Structures are given as structure tokens and as C-alpha cells.
């Protein structure tokens, strides 16, 4: 009996950061409880100052990261205000049943719903938008997110060994479809609702125009790199709803990875770089051990360095000669 | 001595079916006989009634799922009728040398032959055509399908223990790359034969113009949308000649995958979405639990929704509201 | 103290063969020498003559392939001659801190460099220029290989018995983007420098015109193809460092498979095809059992057969029946 059940209310936070939460669970099963707001807005995605019309849940791209535990109960309240034109729904693909709570969940401006589902299979999952109709043209207007389901007792390495973070961060990457014009420039719009053929037209080229993490080009760079110090263990997880990634951490690697985001399932080891399919979220664990600047990349490297898709870590600490030196610094001979 | 050995002739059946087998061999290796017979014929492939040149093994795109076990040997009688234009011939990704038999079974119009080749690896193998000088093009115009090896104790799961699955269907996806206009409308054909210097070209834009499960937008949807009941084990089989796909059910899970499908590798566990390569055949296993509609995607979204790689299952039974509820149905504020 | 151990010095080889190594380590830890000296160079890349302004490691795409034993330190000296016109540096992603070396290595033309880093992650990885500001164009102007650090107990299978192979080759695969006018003919350049803005459009697309082994379409065919015997037991080292690719013996499998390239992770078995997401190295291991020639591919078959990813193996030895025969040859009805 649900009713029976402890609740517990979450306070979400924007990416890429990530809500209040322990690893091994201190409590039973739980009833948690979100609240999210669809909020359609302009976001500017990139330096040249391109604008676009997105729909997000809770005012981010991506969608902030819920946390949970293996049986626990999701219960989320969605809201759309009617200051939004459109009509949303979401698909977890944490949950079983009705298109992921898609069929239950449509809301059209000024109504909201409230969703429950329980959290059976243990990983990190996308969430996103998907109404009838008009589903890529939400996804990829930034209307995705994920959720984590840990394991009662926390993340295990290969041997079953406990593995814990010390840090985590949540990379969501999304790929924009900007309609062009014939001579290459992007076509902008006063409403969302405009767009829609030239959309439809732009996304079946196949070839995003941005590919970004956390809703623009330079995101998670300068004040807002991600940061970590030398001997500290990070979880990022990475979620792309709709098309393919490959992370990788440059100067780093993945100490530990699912790939595709499963807990039950071992991780790979040592990974230099790992392919996220699109409609799945992954996580991958490291030991920071030296100091410096890294790049947060998805290795397409046009994708990451020409279209958007790169953030920085910085991390202070040690510097350690025995792994890295350099013996003779560049110069002339 | 193969000629000791019992002989069966299978009687293949039209996808998404597959034709009867027993998942525990229930006899010694066999030689198992299968006589396809080549098709070029016409197809319409979307509900505009766009209209290719297809090249079919038996009539259907794809051609139908072959089923033996582990050290069977098969027998395939290939059939080039003199109504037909090609030379066409078949690579199997489950045989051992002359390029997967592409190179001992090129028959012009009028001809046929007989392989037979030794199943020695259990897992699901694409097979397709590879005439020299134009294997892309016949792949993309529809002539490839999917072996299955199984086993001859079946399928097992991670810890080795016995998966026995009550349905099994085959979803076979195809990209094409339809000829295209510089004002971007189609250019259709009188025969196979006149498209090939435009059919390379739009094959070497890397784009396609339609990606459809069992060979037309919406084929597998409607009175042929699959079918399965709750708490029923059903074995989705998935293959991709050509180009990489990522499977999701929409509301369900893959519980058991070979994303690779290969058999003698555990399988990946409690997948929301696995990615199958280009040139792959995999499988997914789930047990249903909950009644409805569900949509089989590949998991771009643009390519399911706007391209047309979406099915949809139609579940029976009982609705579980522990696993998932509405608790306030979508209403103003 | 590193000054107290054995320094060994390696002279590198033309891939696709690779230097004189030992799989089971006959010494303790050493310091690996290697020398490289970039080399800007004109070359033609395909059976119609297109010329490109390559950017190379050691004179070859890809540069050769180092290798080396797990916690071996890896010392290169990397030359830039001033004969070329650009800044290089080095990133590899078997190493830990400053970019993977990238941040110790900026060298300009008349200027060499030393970098140390000690190899303690056991596997395949990729190693590539990556300049800031101009990372994805070096890249795909082929400055890019592959670095192997054995286990020091040599390779293992799936259960942890040996795994020793015979012959190695490292294929790397590499996207070229050549710049097109508005009819679709290459633009031809007398500088690597001319290109530039025209690069970066022509990369923008996310479609190469070329995808090739060893440099150029062919490279790995005629006089120059892949060779083995008939039992012997093969390792195919292949890297991507921009896009993902999917490799496949046609007529035969990967037996062991490390699609990531990463050995302290247990191999896939069986595999028909695997991908290799950008940015990583994987390799595959087989033991031919049949003669004749074999291709290997990139198996999206538009990319292998039309833009060159493809190469073949010639095998010397003795036809096996019992795998593969024809029954009736091609013949009329
Ligand atoms: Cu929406
Ligand atoms: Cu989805
Ligand atoms: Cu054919
Ligand atoms: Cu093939
Ligand atoms: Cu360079
Ligand atoms: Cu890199």
C-alpha cells in the first residue's frame, strides 16, 4: 500500500549540478516527489548571438537530473502554464507502461498533472517530451532530461567492490536543427509555433547546426567549468536523447563506464572514449589525478570543436612527474 | 559424412514472422534446406506512394529470418529467375570463407545454385547480397535479411541460466536513397537498371531519404502491428545491413539484449536503448507487463518519426498500477 | 627513479605493419624511445588523382603505431622540421594529464620536443595533433595513430587463458573532407594554409568525401594487401579518431573483440561486425581457417565499396569442405 510509503519532497537544481541525494539508501522504499514547469523561452546557443525558440522543462537544456533508488516511487507534478502555446507530455525511460507515461501526461497550457511510476531497473535514463505528432521537433527544441536510479547499496565496480563518487555532474548534449535559407544563414521566428515545415525541413537533413552541452556553445566553460581537485572521484553522467555521442576526457578517461547506463550490468574499464547511443543516458567514473585544464569533448572532434559539443574540468592539486613530464621543453635546434 | 546426416527442408515464412523451430535442439545437427527465390520487383515505400526498384530474396524486404542451431550445416537453394535484370548473389555473416559464399553463388537471370556452408558461431547474422562493383546498391535497394544460430541448449541468461521465449519476430530496417531532383522531389524509374550513376550518387550523400521497418513507412502498425499478451517473453530480432540503428521500446525495455547478437556473450541487462552497427544483426528479449499500445522505434527520432523506422506492439491484459499511475489526470489550475 | 631503468630505443615502421615487440614482457618496466618528425606533405588519395595537404606523423597516414608494456614509460622526441609551415603537438589518450600531452608538445616549425609519460592503462588507444584553435583540421588532414600497451602478461581471453597471435597489422581509418564548389568538383590548394575557412565549411557538413585505410582508396589491395595462412591467428589493431566505423572480415569474425580496445575488460566473442566509436582504437582477433581473399571493411557499404574504406586480406592454405562448399554451381534451369 502506497499510501503507507514515506514521502519525501525534492528540490530540483539546474544543470550540472545535481540534486541532494545518498548513494546507499538510509532509508526504505519511498514515494519521491518532483515538481517541474514546461517553460518555452528564447535561449541564445551560440557566439554569434543565434536565437531559437526552445521548450524546456523546469527553464534548462537539458532538463535537471532526478535522483532516485532502485523501488523506490517517481511522483512528478508536471506543469504547463498557460503563458506557454503548446501542448507537452513526458516519456521516462526509467518507467513501464504507457509510452513511458507519455499517454498519460499531456497537458496543454494551464493544466498540469501528476505522474507516479516506480523506478524497477537500476541506471541513468533519458526523460523527454514526446507528443503525438510532433516528437523529434520537442526533443530536439531541448525538451529532454534524465534520471538516475541507483541501487539500493550504491555503485559496484567489475569485482562488486563498492565504488563511490565524491562529485557528480550531469552533461546533457543536444543537438539543434536551426533552419537555413538557401545561402546558409539561419531563419528566425517570433513564436515557436512558426517554424514547424521548415523544421521538419532542417531535421530531415540529418545534420545538426549546434551540438552543445547545457543549452549552448561555451556552456561549461570559464566561471562555469566543471571542477574537481587532484584525487577525487566524479561520476558524469551524459545523456543525447536523439542522436549518437562518443565522450571522452581529454587528458583523462573513464575509469569505469556504462556506457549505456545499466547498473546491473559490470562496467567497461580504461575507456578513452565510449558511444552513448542516442536515446540512452551513460556514466563514467574517474580518479582525477593530475592538476590542470581537461576538455570534456564528444570526439567527433568537428562535432565537439566546430559545432559546440566541448567543456572544460579545471583541477587543482599535484602535479605528478612520474606519470607526465616534459623532458625537453619545445624549442629550436 | 554429410551424407549420413538427416535432412529438413524448412518452409520459410514472410517477416516480421519467422518460420517454426525449436529453441533446445531436439535432434542431432541436421542439414537444414531453404530455397529462396530473387525478386526484383516495385515497391511503394511510403504514404506519398514514392516507388523504388526493390531487389528482394523471396519477395520481401526484408528477406526472411533463417533459423538453425549451432553445427547444423545449411543447404540454400538460390533461385535467379529470367524474369529478373541482376546478377545477384548472398554473403552470410555466419559463414566461414568465399566472402561469406558471395564468391561460389553469383547467378545471372535463369541460373541457380546451392551453398551449403556450416553454422559454426551461435547469434543473429545479417546476410545480403555483394555482387562485385555494386554491393551497396543492391543492399540499399532491399536484398538483405538475418540468420539466427541458436544455440543447441538455447538461450541463456547472464548467470547461465535458461531464457525461453513464447513469441519471436524480426524487424529487419532499411535505409534507401531515393534519387532526388535539385528542387528535392524524387526521380522515379521504368527499371532497376536505370538508376545506377544517380542511385551512387545519393548513396554517397550518406543521407537517406527513408529509413522503414519491414520495408514501407508504417508496415509494421495497424492489423500488422506485433502483437504479445502481458507476461509474455518475446524475442525481438533486429537487423541493419548497412547503417547503425539503436533500438528502444517505447514504454518498455530491452531486459536481456545482444546489441551485437552473439550468443555466446552474456547478454546487457535492463537496456532503455543499444545500438546495433551497421553490418549487425542483434536481439532484444523483454517480458511484457503492461498492457497497450507500445512504439518500436530507432531511438533518432527524426529517423523514426520523420524517416519511418516506427512500429508499434499491441499488448493485452491487465493494467498494473503499482508499476505506473495516473494519480491527477491532466486538468486546468 | 626512472635514471636507474633499462632505456630501450624503437624504430618505427610504415603502417600497415608494425615494429618488433615481445607480447609477454622478457623484461621488467623500460623506458621506450621513439622519434617522430612531422611531415607536411602532398598527397593523392584516390583513383582520380585528388591531392590534399596532409599533415603527417612520420610521413604516413596514419602514423605508425608505438608499442609498448603496461607501466613502461613512453619517451618521444617529436621533431617539426622547418620545412612545414604549421604548429603541431601530440595528444595521446593512453596518457594522464596536461590534454594527453598536448599542452607540453606545441612545437613550431625548427623546433623538437621530449615528452614522458608512463603507459598505466592496459589496451589500444589513439594518439593525434590537436593545436588550439585547429584540432578536428589536423586531425582529418590524417595527423593522427595508435599507441598499443600490452598487458605485461600478454593478451587473454574471455576466461583468462593466452591469447597469442602470429602476425598483427594496424589499419588506421581515416575522414577526409575535401573542399567542393557549388557543382561538386574537389578545390585544389597549393598551401596547407590556403584551405581554411574552406575547411572548416567543408567539415561542417559532417559528410566526408573520402574514407580510407592506409591513406588512400586501395592502399590495402594488390601487391600491397593484407596477408596470412591458413591457421594462423591474427590481431587487426584499426583506429578512428574523428567518426565512428564499424569494421568486418567478409568471410569471416572477430573471435575476440575489443570494440574499444581496452584488455582489462574481457573480449566480445563471435563478432560479425563491432563499432569503433571516434576517437578510440579497438582490435579484433582471428584465426583464419579458409583460404582465398578476404575484404575487410568499414560495413556502412556506401563507406567501404563508393568512398574507400575498404582492404583486403589474401590467405594462402588449404580449402576446408566441411565449412563451406558449392553443392551445384551456378548453373541454368
Ligand atoms: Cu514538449
Ligand atoms: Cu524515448
Ligand atoms: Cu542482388
Ligand atoms: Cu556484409
Ligand atoms: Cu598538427
Ligand atoms: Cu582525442
New interface residues.
Given amino acids: 500500500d502506497?499510501s503507507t510509503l514515506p514521502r519525501v519532497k525534492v528540490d530540483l537544481v539546474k544543470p550540472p549540478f545535481v540534486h541532494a541525494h545518498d548513494q546507499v539508501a538510509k532509508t526504505g522504499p519511498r514515494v519521491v516527489e518532483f515538481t517541474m514547469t514546461i517553460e518555452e523561452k528564447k535561449l541564445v546557443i551560440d557566439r554569434e548571438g543565434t536565437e531559437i525558440h526552445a521548450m524546456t522543462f523546469n527553464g534548462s537544456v537539458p532538463g535537471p537530473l532526478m535522483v532516485v533508488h532502485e523501488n523506490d516511487y517517481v511522483?512528478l507534478?508536471l506543469?504547463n502554464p498557460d503563458t506557454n502555446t503548446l501542448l507537452h507530455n513526458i516519456?521516462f525511460?526509467?518507467?513501464?507502461?504507457?509510452?513511458?507515461?507519455?499517454?498519460?501526461?499531456?497537458?496543454?497550457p494551464?493544466?498540469?498533472?501528476?505522474?507516479?511510476?516506480?523506478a524497477?531497473?537500476?541506471?541513468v535514463?533519458?526523460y523527454h517530451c514526446?507528443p503525438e505528432?510532433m516528437?523529434?521537433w520537442h526533443?530536439?527544441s531541448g525538451m529532454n532530461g534524465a534520471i538516475m536510479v541507483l541501487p539500493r547499496d550504491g555503485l559496484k565496480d567489475e569485482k562488486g567492490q563498492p565504488l563511490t563518487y565524491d562529485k557528480i555532474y550531469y552533461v546533457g548534449e543536444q543537438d539543434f536543427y536551426v533552419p537555413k535559407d538557401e545561402a546558409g544563414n539561419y531563419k528566425k521566428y517570433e513564436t515557436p509555433g512558426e517554424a514547424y515545415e521548415d523544421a521538419?525541413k532542417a531535421?530531415?537533413?540529418?545534420?545538426?547546426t549546434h551540438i552543445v552541452f547545457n543549452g549552448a556553445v561555451g556552456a561549461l566553460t570559464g566561471d562555469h567549468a566543471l571542477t574537481a581537485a587532484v584525487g577525487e572521484r566524479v561520476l558524469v553522467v551524459h545523456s543525447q536523447?536523439?542522436?549518437?555521442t562518443?565522450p571522452?576526457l581529454?587528458?583523462?578517461?573513464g575509469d569505469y563506464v556504462w556506457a549505456?547506463?545499466?547498473f546491473?550490468?559490470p562496467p567497461?574499464?580504461?575507456?578513452?572514449?565510449?558511444?552513448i547511443?542516442?536515446?540512452?543516458?551513460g556514466a563514467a567514473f574517474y580518479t582525477f589525478?593530475?592538476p590542470?585544464?581537461?576538455?570534456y569533448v564528444n570526439?567527433?572532434?568537428?562535432?565537439?570543436?566546430?559545432?559546440g559539443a566541448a567543456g572544460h574540468f579545471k583541477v587543482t592539486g599535484e602535479?605528478?612527474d612520474?606519470?607526465?613530464?616534459?623532458?625537453?621543453?619545445?624549442?629550436?635546434?
Fill in positions: 502506497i511522483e507534478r506543469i516519456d525511460h526509467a518507467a513501464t507502461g504507457a509510452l513511458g507515461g507519455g499517454a498519460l501526461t499531456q497537458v496543454n494551464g493544466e498540469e498533472t501528476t505522474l507516479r511510476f516506480k524497477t531497473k537500476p541506471g535514463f533519458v514526446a505528432g516528437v523529434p526533443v530536439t521538419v531535421m530531415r537533413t540529418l545534420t545538426p536523447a536523439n542522436r549518437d562518443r571522452h581529454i587528458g583523462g578517461h549505456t547506463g545499466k546491473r550490468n567497461d574499464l580504461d575507456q578513452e572514449t565510449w558511444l547511443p542516442g536515446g540512452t543516458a589525478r593530475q590542470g585544464v581537461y576538455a570526439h567527433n572532434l568537428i562535432e565537439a570543436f566546430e559545432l602535479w605528478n612520474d606519470l607526465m613530464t616534459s623532458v625537453v621543453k619545445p624549442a629550436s635546434m
